[PDB]
């Protein structure tokens with residue numbers, strides 16, 4: 001039941017969101033990062049300073065060794081492992097157990113994070129981007145093939161963890177309309193941005209620029225990441241809007257804190273960002289609106305806790321647009337694989353203050369008939 005799956009996520013935008021899973025027989029419990037930006041299921045399978053626990057294959061009587069290796073480099077971080085299959089379940093997910101491919105991680109570099117509380121990663125994207133290649137069936141594909149569970153899941157990520165609902169839409173997790181954008185190609189969850197506004201002002205670029213290389217929805221990435229040209233325009237607009245405030249050297253590069261007296265963060269001087277996504281009907285679109293409460297990521301540190309401190313959670317990308325966790329937060333996002341579309345609605349934990357709120361609004365119509373896809 002969906003009600004049983006509500007609030008089955010913990011974690012952060014910055015260090016990711018994780019769900020409890022089990023692997024092996026008898027079941028070994030692990031926390032697993034939920035990642036719509038990759039397609040491998042991999043778990044720590046050897047001791048590591050940052051691992052609280054790990055998959056012990058010798059204690060699983062249902063483990064099968066595939067006698068093959070696998071290497072996965074992400075944008076940051078990488079791991080190497082041995083492939084096998086074993087029985088996998090999600091205690092606070094669907095009431096099923098399936099046999100799935102598992103990469104047992106034996107070596108890693110800057111993959112595991114100190115204090116994150118997860119021990120593996122669940123890549124929920126498509127086989128096309130699986131390593132070593134597309135012949136390695138991803139977990140969700142195995143889940144759908146071996147059970148009767150409908151081919152879709154939804155994510156409700158919440159900031160200061162959320163819910164992953166597998167097999168259907170939980171109407172209790174959103175208000176207002178659910179708006180759908182097509183999945184352009186089934187590899188990453190690739191979508192098309194047709195228009196960008198910052199505080200109501202159109203950036204006025206050829207819309208292909210917004211999707212340069214590609215645009216994807218990626219729960220495993222913290223920031224909104226933008227192609228260079230779009231990033232520079234965004235920073236220009238946000239800097240102009242917040243000009244009454246002085247920001248530290250390096251703030252706009254995303255690795256320097258800015259702090260304000262507790263409760264006094266000047267939210268109002270930062271603009272809202274609107275991303276218009278391609279609709280299901282020709283030249284119609286809808287927008288999701290992003291508040292500074294989203295793109296200024298709070299950095300919890302007891303040492304700095306006399307004040308409220310933030311990092312700028314928009315970054316320049318070399319890999320195309322990435323709608324990461326800070327974008328997904330506050331929205332109910334439906335990965336409707338069966339109908340090749342992604343839905344957005346306002347969730348119960350959407351960000352807002354007394355003047356402004358995150359929103360999903362449509363339809364909007366565009367005159368120009370250009371295809372905004374880059375490829």
Ligand SMILES: CC(F)(F)c1cccc(CN[C@H]2CS(=O)(=O)C[C@@H](Cc3cc(F)c(N)c(Br)c3)[C@@H]2O)c1
Nearest residue numbers: 015016037038039073074075076077111129220221
């Ligand atoms: C082919 C591939 F593996 F799917 C691939 C390769 C490069 C980029 C992408 C896009 N998705 C990536 C973006 S990322 O910033 O590297 C985070 C990564 C998951 C991840 C890896 C990590 F280490 C750590 N700590 C954390 Br937290 C989270 C996503 O998965 C996918």
